[PDB]
Amino acid sequence: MKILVIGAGPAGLVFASQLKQARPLWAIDIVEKNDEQEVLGWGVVLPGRPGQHPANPLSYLDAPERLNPQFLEDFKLVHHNEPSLMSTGVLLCGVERRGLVHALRDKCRSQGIAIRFESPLLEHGELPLADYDLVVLANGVNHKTAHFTEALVPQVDYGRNKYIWYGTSQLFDQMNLVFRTHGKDIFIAHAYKYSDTMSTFIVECSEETYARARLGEMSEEASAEYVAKVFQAELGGHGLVSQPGLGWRNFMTLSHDRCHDGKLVLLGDALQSGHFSIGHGTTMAVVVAQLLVKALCTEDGVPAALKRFEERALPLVQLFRGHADNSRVWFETVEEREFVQSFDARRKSLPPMPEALAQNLRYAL
Ligand SMILES: Cc1cc2nc3c(=O)[nH]c(=O)nc-3n(C[C@@H](O)[C@H](O)[C@@H](O)COP(=O)(O)OP(=O)(O)OC[C@H]3O[C@@H](n4cnc5c(N)ncnc54)[C@H](O)[C@@H]3O)c2cc1C
Numbered sequence: 012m013k014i015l016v017i018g019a020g021p022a023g024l025v026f027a028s029q030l031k032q033a034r035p036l037w038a039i040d041i042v043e044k045n046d047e048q049e050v051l052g053w054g055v056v057l058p059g060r061p062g063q064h065p066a067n068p069l070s071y072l073d074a075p076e077r078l079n080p081q082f083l084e085d086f087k088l089v090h091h092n093e094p095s096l097m098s099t100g101v102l103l104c105g106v107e108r109r110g111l112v113h114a115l116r117d118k119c120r121s122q123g124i125a126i127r128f129e130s131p132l133l134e135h136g137e138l139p140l141a142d143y144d145l146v147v148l149a150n151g152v153n154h155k156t157a158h159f160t161e162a163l164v165p166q167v168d169y170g171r172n173k174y175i176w177y178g179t180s181q182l183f184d185q186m187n188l189v190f191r192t193h194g195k196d197i198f199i200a201h202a203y204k205y206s207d208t209m210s211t212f213i214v215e216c217s218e219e220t221y222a223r224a225r226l227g228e229m230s231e232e233a234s235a236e237y238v239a240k241v242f243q244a245e246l247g248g249h250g251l252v253s254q255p256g257l258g259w260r261n262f263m264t265l266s267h268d269r270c271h272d273g274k275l276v277l278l279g280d281a282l283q284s285g286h287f288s289i290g291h292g293t294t295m296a297v298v299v300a301q302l303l304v305k306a307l308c309t310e311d312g313v314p315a316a317l318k319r320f321e322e323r324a325l326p327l328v329q330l331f332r333g334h335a336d337n338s339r340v341w342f343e344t345v346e347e348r349e350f351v352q353s354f355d356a357r358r359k360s361l362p363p364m365p366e367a368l369a370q371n372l373r374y375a376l
Contacts, residue, residue: 012037012313015143017132019043021068022279022296023149024115028071029304031122039124044131044150047116051256052108053178053212054205056083056186056290058365059102065372066294069106072114080104081204087187088351089245095351097185101365103290105205135159138275145313146275147303149296152263154281162272170262170286171343173226174215177235181249183210190345193241196220197346200242201287212251213287214238217346227259234259262286262339266332270324271317276303283328285335288342291364295331298368299324301375323371333361 014030016023019041031039061069061080069075082104088095116126132138138146138159148154148163158164179202186203197220201213221227226234235251265284270277277283279296303320310316341357 012145012307013143014039014145014147015139016041016147016149018147018149018151018279018281019116019126019128020112020149020151020279020296021115021293022151022281022300023147024112024119025068025071025297026147026149026278026300026303027119027124028115028122029300030307031119031124033304033308035123041119041124041126042130042132043126043128044153045128047128048109048113050109050112051254053176053254054105054107054203054209055111055211055293056103056105056203056205058294060104065376066297066368067104068111068115068293068297069104072118075114078106078110078114079206080106081206083184083186083203085185087185088354089187089189089191090350091190092244094187098351100186103186105203105211107206107209133157140274143274145307147278148275148281149278149300151280152265152284154277155263155265159275160272162269163267163275163277166264166266166268168264168266170264170339172215172217173221173259173261174213175226175234175238175253175259176257177212177214177238177251177253179210179212179246179249179251180208181210181212181246182208187245189242189245191241191244196223198238198241199342199345200245202245212242212246214242214251215342217343221259231258264332264335264339267328268325270321270328274313276317276320278303282324283332285331286339286342288338289334289358289364291331291334294364294368295328298371298375299327302327302371305375323374327367327371330362330367331364334358334364337361 057067059067061075085097085099183202183204189200191198198216204210239250302324306316306320310319337358
């Protein structure tokens with residue numbers, strides 16, 4: 012069989028490797044838009060301990076300890092200049108995005124999966140459909156501007172508040188979202204350590220706040236220090252550094268009510284993206300990728316496999332979407348608000364994620 016994967020990110024890679032390992036003879040190639048050492052983002056939080064949790068991408072590496080994963084067991088919430096509590100959750104590990112993506116790429120190559128960098132695919136006329144049995148679209152949020160077919164156009168929902176992905180030397184040994192009211196403005200930060208020297212610092216605020224502080228009409232370094240000053244209490248004396256490709260923006264939720272179209276199948280953020288306020292994007296990429304692999308190893312043809320894939324994928328992506336919206340909305344509406352109670356039940360009466368992921372995991376694996 013011949014499979015083409017557009018996108019060398021978590022979803023694309025986890026699928027490639029998973030499938031190659033099970034079907035070595037199958038031909039699997041990947042095309043990446045960017046260069047080899049061009050990965051965006053700082054650090055991400057993942058479920059469980061590498062090697063012990065099937066949902067974590069680090070569990071598919073020959074040596075995950077190499078990336079120096081940071082294990083976080085506690086959660087600190089600062090509200091009104093006071094740590095409401097340290098309600099510990101479950102076991103989550105943080106690790107560098109770049110490092111993760113690079114490792115997964117080395118793994119695919121060591122398995123015989125070719126990856127052609129700096130080879131973006133945008134136009135539908137660029138799809139060598141007649142030369143492949145399956146085309147996997149795992150090109151992240153770029154899918155929005157490159158959907159290849161009207162029948163695969165996203166829903167696209169722009170988050171109400173602005174956010175930016177900062178990186179910092181301040182070590183947050185324990186996860187903690189902070190609410191700092193600086194003047195008439197409300198700033199929210201999501202921080203956690205992902206390495207021995209770096210922490211992720213996701214900051215967000217309303218459009219009004221973004222306009223008052225002129226975070227956009229200001230210099231990248233100038234905005235950072237400004238935000239760094241508002242949180243100097245939490246960051247100690249450490250500043251904030253942004254990436255040339257992140258910057259300020261509104262979260263785009265790419266939704267779908269269909270998983271495939273002929274030889275094309277969506278995967279990862281390209282299929283469904285969800286606000287980062289629940290940290291499941293990479294987990295979703297991994298679980299859904301496994302669903303496609305099982306379907307391909309059990310069904311006779313591609314069409315037959317896609318159909319069976321559809322069955323369990325959609326129900327899962329809708330649930331992820333459901334949780335992503337509740338959490339996102341909750342965060343967008345903080346100004347108009349035991350404060351540690353709402354945040355907890357913000358996911359309403361929706362079935363838990365860790366229960367749904369496992370259900371499909373035991374099935375695909
Ligand atoms: C602020 C923020 C914080 C987040 N924090 C977390 C977190 O802590 N935990 C978590 O799990 N996730 C987090 N995410 C989520 C996020 O990382 C995604 O869910 C992502 O990992 C999905 O993986 P992917 O491989 O599907 O996408 P991507 O990483 O976007 O990969 C897409 C790939 O396609 C390539 N490319 C894109 N367009 C094209 C094109 N048209 N054709 C060819 N190649 C193309 C890109 O270079 C990239 O290699 C965060 C996101 C943001 C925005």
